[PDB]
A paper describes a structure:
It proteolytically processes the viral polyproteins pp1a and pp1ab at no less than 11 cleavage sites, and thereby also ensures its own release. In this work, we demonstrate that the [name]-[name]-2 [name] is subject to redox regulation in vitro and contains multiple redox switches including a disulfide-dithiol switch between the catalytic residue C145 and C117, as well as a SONOS switch of residues C22, C44 and K61.
SONOS variants, in particular those containing an exchange of residue K61, are very susceptible to aggregation under oxidizing conditions and exhibit an atypical early onset of thermal denaturation (30–35 °C) with almost no cooperativity of unfolding, indicating a very loosely structured protein. Under reducing conditions, the protein is structurally stable. This would imply a structurally stabilizing function of the SONOS bridge under oxidizing conditions. The SONOS bridge structurally stabilizes the monomer that is formed upon oxidation by covalently tethering three structural elements within a monomer.
Numbering used by the authors:
A (entry chain A), B (entry chain C): 1 to 306
């Protein structure tokens, strides 16, 4: 059995990553059909980064100012348009490795695998999720722009993330493939801090069910609690308010293990007021909120007795 | 910034995964050139994992019994050989997606990425480590046999693991691509179990070294201690004794850092009693030992792989 933080096979995405260069700046781009997507701050320099006028920079730019590299073969740019905060570079040849894809703007709390890239080549793949403050706790260095996040459903690659910047607190912020940012962020050089990062309550509960399958059944309580008793009382270290939509998707995990959704919420009420003197849970020490209820069933193909 | 447990881009490996079927059992196989590698226990139906004669079943079974299937086209096997504990099938045509591969055997302590596959189709990829007891705490389900572990240098894929079975204790055991098991395990399912597991000391120091490279500073101090006395507490606790070569491997981690290898020993001997009076230690308030120093520099630099 076992349970680990897995990521989707990044193979289908590697075939779409290319290198985009504009002047002295070099970052990654997503090659889909005959269009190359990348963050729009590639056409900017250091002097004009205080308050860039992308409309002015885009028009005054040229097609040959962009140097798109697909591995070692250079791609010819025939047109350039801007959609919000992502740049669309139209090329002459379509990407033969284009997989069936879609653009999905995920909500804060959902997970997705990221493919970190540098100079158009993939470096690594990891799983993560958007924090409540519309940020991600990924790992990026200089030249990581263009690193996309994605999920794979059946066989279609649902892109959702497009890395742009890194907050001074260490976290990262990005957009979707349509160019809309995630959170109160804008791509310009100004005093821009992150926000209050709480905790994904629903993910924590799901992570508990994942542990119950692989042994670890010593954190079950027999005193369910209501809604306000889990919010106005169980919010000492900031936890996202659980809604009646979370218990809907937690059904399969509840009918599988046998622990009611409301009953599992009482388990956290005991751990959030005490903790452990050294007793580990599944694998980690602090509650992991990086596993959605869909990730658990995805990796714990258990049967739900009825 | 940021430090995640990344896995290698599995693209070059996904193109080598096929579905091997013999009789009624179907497990995964690695298609490299015109040879398909898969566990030897594919020729053994679910009624022979006790003491079956393999060289007798191999010469008895012909080529029509096997059924190798790629993405959508079925292959044709010609020669079937058994090397140690891997069933080699010499197919008709060679895999056009064959990368510059390489069969290497890793000793307990090194890390590698695992590509989980079912029915010849990848499903997930994660990063793990070879435990001191010659096992891995991976995530596998029924039908995952044949899934391989690999490392990438740049253009070369270093295969090092092939899943064969799961032990009753939850961990998983397998072989290299030469067919030799990791540890005193056998393919015939008996009452075999893994030994006592220990924590990799060199990997914890390499991980604690990245914490400083990132910016986390609160558990640091300076109480020098040479290579003599630290082994006392390392063996009394549940840790692998820090050998002499482990110090030389941490060399490059001290060049672009300046901290002495013997300096971090004072910070580790104190975080094993008082608990976590601070909690935040690069995320996850516990000792992580699945970061080999060779992979800590690659994530703190930007080493890409094609």
């Amino acid at each position: 059995s076992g349970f680990r933080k897995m990521a989707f096979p990044s193979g289908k995405v590697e075939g779409c990553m290319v290198q985009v260069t504009c002047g002295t700046t070099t970052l990654n781009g997503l090659w889909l059909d005959d269009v190359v997507y990348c963050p729009r701050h590639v056409i900017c320099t250091s002097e004009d980064m205080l308050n860039p006028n992308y409309e002015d920079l885009l028009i005054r730019a040229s097609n040959h100012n962009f140097l798109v590299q697909a591995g070692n073969v250079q791609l010819r740019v025939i047109g350039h348009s801007m959609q919000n905060c992502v740049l669309k570079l139209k090329v002459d040849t379509a990407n033969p490795k284009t997989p069936k894809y879609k653009f999905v703007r995920i909500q804060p709390g959902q997970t997705f695998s990221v493919l970190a890239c540098y100079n158009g080549s993939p470096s690594g793949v990891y799983q993560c999720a958007m924090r409540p403050n519309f940020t991600i706790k990924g790992s990026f260095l200089n030249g990581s722009c263009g690193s996309v996040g994605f999920n794979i459903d059946y066989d279609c690659v649902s892109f959702c993330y497009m890395h742009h910047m890194e907050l001074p607190t260490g976290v990262h912020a990005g957009t979707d493939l349509e160019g809309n940012f995630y959170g109160p962020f804008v791509d310009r050089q100004t005093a821009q801090a992150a926000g209050t990062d709480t905790t994904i309550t629903v993910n924590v509960l799901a992570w508990l069910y994942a542990a119950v399958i692989n042994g670890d059944r010593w954190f079950l309580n027999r005193f369910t609690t209501t809604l306000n008793d889990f919010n106005l009382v169980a919010m000492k270290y900031n936890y996202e308010p659980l809604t009646q939509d979370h218990v809907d998707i937690l059904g399969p995990l509840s009918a599988q293990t046998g622990i009611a959704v409301l009953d599992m919420c009482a388990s956290l009420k005991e751990l959030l007021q005490n903790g452990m003197n050294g007793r580990t849970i599944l694998g980690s020490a602090l509650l992991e909120d990086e596993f959605t209820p869909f990730d658990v069933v995805r990796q714990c193909s258990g049967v739900t007795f009825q």
